[PDB]
Design an enzyme around this catalytic site. Structure first.
Site, PDB file in Angstrom:
ATOM      1  N   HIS A  59     -27.729  15.925  -1.797  1.00  9.87           N
ATOM      2  CA  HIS A  59     -29.008  16.434  -1.736  1.00  9.87           C
ATOM      3  C   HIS A  59     -28.955  16.139  -0.160  1.00  9.87           C
ATOM      4  CE1 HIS A  59     -32.838  18.394  -3.170  1.00  9.87           C
ATOM      5  NE2 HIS A  59     -32.835  17.635  -1.803  1.00  9.87           N
TER       6      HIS A  59
ATOM      7  N   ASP B 245      -1.704   8.088  -1.962  1.00 13.46           N
ATOM      8  CA  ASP B 245      -1.758  10.152  -2.917  1.00 13.46           C
ATOM      9  C   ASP B 245      -2.038  10.749  -1.524  1.00 13.46           C
ATOM     10  OD1 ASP B 245      -2.449  11.989  -4.251  1.00 13.46           O
ATOM     11  OD2 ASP B 245      -2.992  10.482  -5.936  1.00 13.46           O
TER      12      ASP B 245
ATOM     13  N   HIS C  56      -5.258   8.981  -1.098  1.00 15.40           N
ATOM     14  CA  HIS C  56      -5.920   7.303  -1.595  1.00 15.40           C
ATOM     15  C   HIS C  56      -5.122   6.814  -1.529  1.00 15.40           C
ATOM     16  CE1 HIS C  56      -5.529   8.176  -5.797  1.00 15.40           C
ATOM     17  NE2 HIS C  56      -6.531   9.241  -5.612  1.00 15.40           N
ATOM     18  N   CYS C  57      -5.279   5.366  -1.278  1.00 17.85           N
ATOM     19  CA  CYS C  57      -4.204   4.181  -1.906  1.00 17.85           C
ATOM     20  C   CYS C  57      -3.923   4.577  -3.617  1.00 17.85           C
ATOM     21  CB  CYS C  57      -4.391   3.828  -1.191  1.00 17.85           C
ATOM     22  SG  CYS C  57      -3.082   1.732  -1.475  1.00 17.85           S
TER      23      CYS C  57
ATOM     24  N   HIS D 174      -3.972  14.212  -2.339  1.00 18.07           N
ATOM     25  CA  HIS D 174      -4.346  15.903  -3.720  1.00 18.07           C
ATOM     26  C   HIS D 174      -4.150  17.215  -2.986  1.00 18.07           C
ATOM     27  CE1 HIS D 174      -7.526  12.713  -5.899  1.00 18.07           C
ATOM     28  NE2 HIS D 174      -6.118  12.375  -6.079  1.00 18.07           N
TER      29      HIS D 174
ATOM     30  N   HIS E  59     -28.309  12.326  -5.138  1.00 12.71           N
ATOM     31  CA  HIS E  59     -29.694  12.170  -5.943  1.00 12.71           C
ATOM     32  C   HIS E  59     -29.844  11.502  -7.246  1.00 12.71           C
ATOM     33  CE1 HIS E  59     -33.772  13.960  -6.168  1.00 12.71           C
ATOM     34  NE2 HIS E  59     -33.918  13.975  -4.668  1.00 12.71           N
TER      35      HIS E  59
ATOM     36  N   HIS F 106       0.950  -1.149  -0.034  1.00  9.33           N
ATOM     37  CA  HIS F 106       0.148  -0.147  -0.257  1.00  9.33           C
ATOM     38  C   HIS F 106       0.836   1.146  -0.248  1.00  9.33           C
ATOM     39  CE1 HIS F 106      -3.705  -2.191   1.130  1.00  9.33           C
ATOM     40  NE2 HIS F 106      -3.067  -2.269   2.291  1.00  9.33           N
TER      41      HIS F 106
ATOM     42  N   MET G 195     -10.032   2.177  -0.111  1.00  8.08           N
ATOM     43  CA  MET G 195      -8.724   2.593   0.745  1.00  8.08           C
ATOM     44  C   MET G 195      -8.586   4.358   0.628  1.00  8.08           C
ATOM     45  SD  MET G 195      -5.368   0.380   1.209  1.00  8.08           S
ATOM     46  CE  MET G 195      -4.007   1.099   2.568  1.00  8.08           C
TER      47      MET G 195
ATOM     48  N   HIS H  40      -7.403  -0.299  -4.777  1.00  6.61           N
ATOM     49  CA  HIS H  40      -7.508  -0.493  -3.873  1.00  6.61           C
ATOM     50  C   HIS H  40      -8.410   0.788  -3.303  1.00  6.61           C
ATOM     51  CE1 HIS H  40      -3.265  -2.098  -2.383  1.00  6.61           C
ATOM     52  NE2 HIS H  40      -3.524  -3.144  -3.297  1.00  6.61           N
TER      53      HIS H  40
ATOM     54  N   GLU I 109     -30.045  23.076  -4.120  1.00  7.98           N
ATOM     55  CA  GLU I 109     -30.454  21.988  -4.179  1.00  7.98           C
ATOM     56  C   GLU I 109     -29.807  20.761  -3.584  1.00  7.98           C
ATOM     57  OE1 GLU I 109     -34.296  21.428  -7.244  1.00  7.98           O
ATOM     58  OE2 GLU I 109     -32.270  22.307  -8.370  1.00  7.98           O
ATOM     59  N   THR I 110     -28.702  20.432  -5.041  1.00  3.23           N
ATOM     60  CA  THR I 110     -27.945  19.378  -4.792  1.00  3.23           C
ATOM     61  C   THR I 110     -26.757  20.509  -5.709  1.00  3.23           C
ATOM     62  OG1 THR I 110     -29.806  17.918  -5.384  1.00  3.23           O
ATOM     63  CG2 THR I 110     -28.035  17.620  -6.780  1.00  3.23           C
TER      64      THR I 110
END
Ligand code: NO2
Ligand code: NO2
Ligand code: NO2
Ligand code: CU
Ligand code: CU
Ligand code: CU
Lengths: 333, 333, 333
Positions: free
Chosen positions: B249, B92, B129-130, B94, B300, B89, B144, B139, B273-274
């Site tokens: 939502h 990363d 994330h892995c 972001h 939604h 494993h 993960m 993964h 709303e969304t």
């Protein structure tokens, strides 16, 4: 105005991901910018397995080349369909106004050519694509799409109205292909375009691409064809998807300034990790590299990227900054 | 700067949807913020039917815990892969710049650990994330992934530059799982990770999740684990999706201020709303509750929510406002 | 305030894509705006092949009618479920606050009615839809959804705070249907709603619509029911999708001003080619026509548009502008 009084400049296009030379800030008044493209139907191998399709291209590439003009220039396109092709084609510019983007005026059978002119009244990056009535998604998803950039006359601006100037530009066209499969899951192959059409339609109607690629093939933007930059360089990456949503991401970097739906009169979104470019749109992301090494540029549906093909690389030269990132303790038992 | 001169603060993480204590406005200068996570491969039951998968987790949960720092702090992560696990494993971020977000520097076999440091130069919520080379989507879609919040040093701001201060925060991680199915449609089960890998790849390539869940399982954020608030309380909900688009939502409410793609230097979108959170992104929505009762918080695509699992609840205490909503005539013949 | 002291105005709704008469700028103070809708379960033919489904409608149409009020008006809806229907229904307004958007207060069996009131505190276009507990996506994806527009009291504004005034408005509701298929791929037909429910659920869980249509059927917004405009006219197109993302595009035009996620306190996006409306959202696009002729209005997943149904037409009258676009050399050998 009498268009005949304006300067004419002929552009000589280049193959993606490179982009023809241009000026960010316009050094002249409005011009008629002359482009020529020749349609080419050809076989293309799109994956490592050797899957070969019958592609439909502008100028021999998937995607078609990036065209660059300034706002309120005129784009004059000579579109050639040689008699070595077998299908009817046309072109729709999302940058243009009227006649279905030009498609209603540019229908060319094999052995015909046409010349279209339109005024580029809105700045931004835009998709162009073939769109023959009744057969639109088949031509688009066979590779017949590209993009056009309409720069503001005074170049790009940040969210505060300050200039943004790129040092390098690349055009990444992302293509969803729908290669028909038999019941067992293997790709089917066809003897003529007419014999392929119904199974092409069936395959498209699943809404599940078999391949999603950059620059026409799995791995096209890797190895000796990786994108390149240096630490400190400002890079604009134009990304288009004529038919399906994508979500670009620079692994190890960001979009410092992003126009996710591609239109420069809007302020950019800052500091994006990932951006959504809707199907039928071009977007643009500006980044200043801060670290050297390999980066992956991907659609961040990671299945789409690493299993279906939507991944490329940057190779970046320069100094490593340990303040920004370092291994404090390397992996060890 | 000599990082060794900066304060160090150790964070003790908590299980989602809760979030470790922090300050919205930074009460100190820049710090090195120390985190530890231990990877755990474990079986998880993810639906009401009893479907059990082999999950891959940071700190024993799906999603991994929310980490919170301020802009220009340093994040120093000790990542432990115990010898009771069987796979390689890494991680990363972001939020980070360089080395594939840290993945190139954090590859740990079972029985190894590593320590990564990076400078959190951009404010926002971000996915982590892995990402082991060659096996990335497996993964990620095994659970993960998590998120990190990098707060501006002066906390959050509305579209006018005025402060926004939350009273409560929750982290909703949304996970798409791709449980392989046989021809008849029943889930297949596997003896080892290597024996599962090809059918995992096949299942992912359909681009059709079998399950889409919040906090690791159907119903996880319901009943005694419903989210809670009071009328008048300001709540921030951080939502991440490391691999696939979602559209949150709040049923009966709104996002009063939303950073749909999660980056705080941008003004928020008002009165949503969304919102669309693209795959590979974290977003954040701020809402002030105005009515008591049960709310559903959903993706939604209502099929994804109510048939595949992407639905949770809020239970909100307080007074009912009949000016805002009332039954004038209750249902009657 | 005593709501009984406010003016009451009764609206008489019209069938989409048309919209009931209203004022963009409010000519009165706050009002109670009275609406009535009668639920109708009915058979609908949705494609050219003659496929007939059992639709669930508000007021006999897919989508349900567009309701229009101003910010801080009260919406008072009489919802009627006649005894000729067979199912339980309700209504959730995304514009409203509390009680699951009204759904918890409006459950009506056949032979019942109810009256709901809510304060429209946020301006924008919003989805409304049926949402019976446990059966939500089946009712929504059977057609039981529409939209409501809550105008700012001083009408619409551009990104600079200047007025935007439309001359015409249309409401395009986009519906994803999931018609169950047998193994060979033909649609299955059912004797009662209960006998259909499990295969409806199975069909929805594929996440692959069989049909994606505007105004309830393939071709509904073509031919004698094409949308119309004149060169120079300002048109607002409200577009909703209660369950699934869409990406509208006017072929040959633009969205000059777009609120892609529909909320008017936000500045619009300018000069869009294509916009993403997330599932569960209404959006609105403003365009001033500059050329006559036929336009196609589509979801720019072109498969969704031209193969599954998500395409309509505008017929636009007036003068052709050859400065904006012309054929320089018509197609020729
Ligand atoms: O950011 N990498 O998948
Ligand atoms: O807003 N409810 O599905
Ligand atoms: O823009 N036409 O597909
Ligand atoms: Cu073509
Ligand atoms: Cu892993
Ligand atoms: Cu209903």
């Amino acid at each position: 105005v009498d268009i005949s009084t304006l300067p004419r400049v002929k552009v000589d296009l280049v193959k993606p991901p490179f982009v023809h030379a241009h000026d960010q800030v316009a050094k002249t008044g409005p011009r008629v910018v002359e482009f020529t493209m020749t349609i080419e139907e050809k076989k293309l191998v799109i994956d490592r397995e050797g899957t070969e399709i019958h592609a439909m291209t502008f100028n021999g590439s998937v995607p078609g080349p990036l065209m660059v003009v300034h706002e309120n220039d005129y784009v004059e396109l000579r579109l050639i369909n040689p008699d070595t092709n077998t299908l009817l084609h046309n072109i729709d510019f999302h940058a243009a106004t009227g006649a279905l983007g030009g498609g209603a005026l540019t229908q060319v059978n094999p052995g015909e050519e046409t010349t279209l002119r339109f005024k580029a009244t809105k700045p931004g990056v835009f998709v162009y694509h073939c769109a023959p009535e009744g057969m639109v998604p088949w031509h688009v998803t066979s590779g017949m799409n590209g993009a056009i950039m309409v720069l503001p006359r005074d170049g790009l601006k940040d969210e505060k109205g300050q200039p943004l100037t790129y040092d390098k530009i690349y055009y990444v066209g992302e293509q969803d292909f729908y290669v028909p499969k038999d019941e067992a899951g293997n790709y089917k192959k066809y003897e003529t375009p007419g014999e392929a059409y119904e199974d092409a339609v069936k395959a498209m109607r699943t809404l599940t691409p078999t391949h999603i690629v950059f620059n026409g093939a799995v791995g096209a933007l890797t190895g000796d064809h990786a994108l390149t930059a240096a630490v400190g360089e400002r890079v604009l990456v134009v990304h288009s998807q004529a038919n399906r949503d994508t979500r670009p991401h620079l692994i190890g970097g960001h979009g410092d300034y992003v126009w996710a739906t591609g239109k420069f009169r809007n302020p950019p979104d800052l500091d994006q990790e990932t951006w959504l470019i809707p199907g039928g749109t071009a977007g643009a992301a500006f980044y200043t590299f801060r670290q050297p090494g390999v980066y992956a540029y991907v659609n961040h549906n990671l299945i789409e990227a690493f299993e279906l093909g939507a991944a490329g690389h940057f190779k970046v030269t320069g100094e490593w900054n340990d303040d920004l990132m370092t291994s404090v303790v390397k992996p060890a038992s």
